DNA sequence: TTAAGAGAAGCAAATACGTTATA
DNA sequence: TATAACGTATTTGCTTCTCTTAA
């Protein structure tokens, strides 16, 4: 084996690694019979691998046949004391088997440090976790971390005393199910009293403690807690910082760095938002050390605080400091850069962009696509998976946008494999190809495709159908919703609900939480009393359960400020309704002062984004009066989805469009639609060209308000071509000035291109 | 050599909020 | 109008590396 002198040193730098490097290049051929070159080098990357490699050749073959996988074998031998843990499978892989333990089960105990004497700790307290309430499953999760024998021997010791102290058995498990959990428990048993007497909830104590190094986080609260409060930090905010891996390091780093960041501009809420992830301590230190080099490249400190405000943000800030020059010397705009690094693992997505970006444009993909596939958590995996799978997907008959669809969401790497693995089978069930692309086309897409295959048969008989199985999953509800439909549609079919009802409530992101939410709330709603249609209206949108709970919490106060039932439902019955309902109560005061009636607030709030639109009607209503717009006009412009954006647009492009010849009434008609901000934008930049081509002012206004930005961009691209082919201006305008005008125009060109 | 523990980075999935385009 | 279809934020939950301390 020709080891690159990099590969060598990575073996030699281990405690005993000199002895190992001899051993591998002595018994090459033996080892070659069980291990790949990768497997070897991975085993040899741990302290004393000489003895671990010898333990693969003694116990490995005699474990291929005891029911273990070679992938499992490596994960156990490759580790500190990995030779003891492998010895301790051929020692007791049976006394555990004789007690109903899987192979993945035994593998999961041995595949961390200390694995050997944890296996024999399970062997002894399978009977004391038994007559204790604890399941066999429990035992494994606790023991699936480094040295979980400490965790086991200690759960048995703290459970009695804090079983009777407001802690679930599945809180005890959350705490001990982490490397260094013995510490975690023993630190709780001595600190939850002092923490209750400081206003910290029981749930909070759980979260603070249920990470690696939970014990350090727990003292750090009793140490820096009070001192953090007298800086401007909530007990809510404090427990969010400490609720992560290295909370003790994030807290301490806030103190050390906060007042220095709080003078560089960084608001205390921004700072915490950065300190509130894993490695929050690292981000903080990195932000303060890369502000200027970044302040001098076009990065606003709100933009800087985004890149820092995720997992491994410290690594994001640096990979951008170094590679913004390169990617800007490529064709990437600052906002694209921030998308590809403003995610967890952004440093990786970035490097992956350079590493595959050119090779991808060659494959067919423009840069809007590459930013879409990289602008996700795990975008590095996403781009790499698109390469390796590209020829395959083409064979299976998938469009290029159909690739960027599946690849464009989180876990897109996974989604692509799933449509190769599953999918050829899914046709046999009777699903369409675009039906399949919908299933794979959202987050958790790989997961959904499996769920469909597992469940669709039992579902169709249960009184549902494939078309509204596609509906439930293409609409983001996913695997979770399909499992929840299955297990709940019976309780739901005794409480009075219909199938298109159950379909509607499932057919949204979060729809599994909603199905259960209705079940828990439907009575109290009916008690108040809203009808079933109301419950379904409120529930059947993204974030359903939030909306259902907010109504119940606020229906009183709203009815105390002039608003009717049918008002509350209309404000609740869109995405963000929970948000829309809190904003009504908070901005209803000054909106009555500024000339807006009750039914108007409902008009402004009774769409998705109602919280934005109400706030936006609080900002611009002064300076829209002094431009000439009536109150009634401000209500039309805001009273659509995206209302907030269309009021910013009427401000921003309003004047520049006046010169061009558009009257204020015109501006209103173009802005008073879903997408109005874009209709104005498009008229702004494409209006003058269309005027040079022979189109009326009135023509442009007719298209922009029927119509829309899309229909204008289409007249723009193909108008000339339709003319050359003998179409008239009057034709092209009548056809584009309606709903789906864009598509109508592009169906009119097509026989030409 | 083997354990124990602590911190950080990255990946995937689920859920929540918002904006646009389409009859 | 209601909804399809995106675009992103926020939240949970791992697995995997690296690193230190300790015996």
Author numbering: 15 to 767
Please quote the paper that reports this structure.
The electrostatic potential of BurrH shows two electropositive stripes running along the protein which contact the phosphate backbones of the double helix. In contrast to the TALEs, which only interact with their coding strand, the presence of the second electropositive stripe on the surface of BurrH determines the interaction of the repeat array with both strands of its DNA target. The 4th, 12th and 13th repeats in BurrH show new associations (Thr–A and Arg–G) involving bases in the coding and noncoding strands, respectively. Thr193 and Thr457 in BurrH associate with A+4 and A+12 in the coding strand.
In a search for putative DNA-binding domains, BurrH, a protein that recognizes a 19 bp DNA target, was identified. Each BuD repeat is composed of 33 residues, only eight of which are strictly conserved between the repeats.
